């Protein structure tokens, strides 16, 4: 088995907006992986934003983002969210989707270098 992570949504957007943009998972067993969020914007390096371990389980929030981004996962559909609410131009970047096998790693998990496959990024601009 391998992973394939396929990202949709993006585009450009004035402040106090919203977006949501999904992260499609093929494969076996999306339950056995750890859901994140990271953020990469002009010039800086790479930022943890969310993640999620499983459906009845409370999610790993950044600071700079929470009570604005929430994680949820669809597993009918087997499709990971984030919904951007009231947006900043401070959340301008590229949005990348990861996974990350549960065995042998650990909860919560905001190191990059440990997550195991890669969505291809998705382009979110926000501006006044």
């Known amino acids: 088995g391998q992973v394939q992570l396929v990202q949709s949504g993006g585009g450009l957007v004035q402040a106090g907006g919203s977006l949501r943009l999904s992260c499609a998972f093929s494969?076996?067993?999306?339950?056995?992986?750890?859901m994140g969020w990271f953020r990469q914007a002009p010039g800086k390096e790479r930022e943890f934003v969310a993640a999620?371990?499983?459906?009845?389980?409370?999610?790993d929030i950044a600071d700079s983002v929470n009570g604005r981004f929430t994680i949820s996962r669809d597993n009918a559909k087997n499709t990971l969210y984030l919904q951007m609410d009231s947006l900043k131009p401070e959340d301008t970047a590229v949005y990348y989707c990861?996974?990350?096998?549960?065995?042998?790693?650990?909860?919560?998990?905001?190191?990059?270098?440990?997550?195991?496959?890669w969505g291809q990024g998705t382009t979110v601009t926000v501006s006044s």
């Open positions: 999620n371990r499983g459906r009845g389980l409370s999610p």
């Open positions: 990861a996974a990350d096998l549960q065995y042998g790693s650990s909860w919560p998990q905001r190191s990059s270098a440990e997550y195991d496959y």
């Open positions: 494969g076996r067993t999306f339950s056995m992986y750890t």
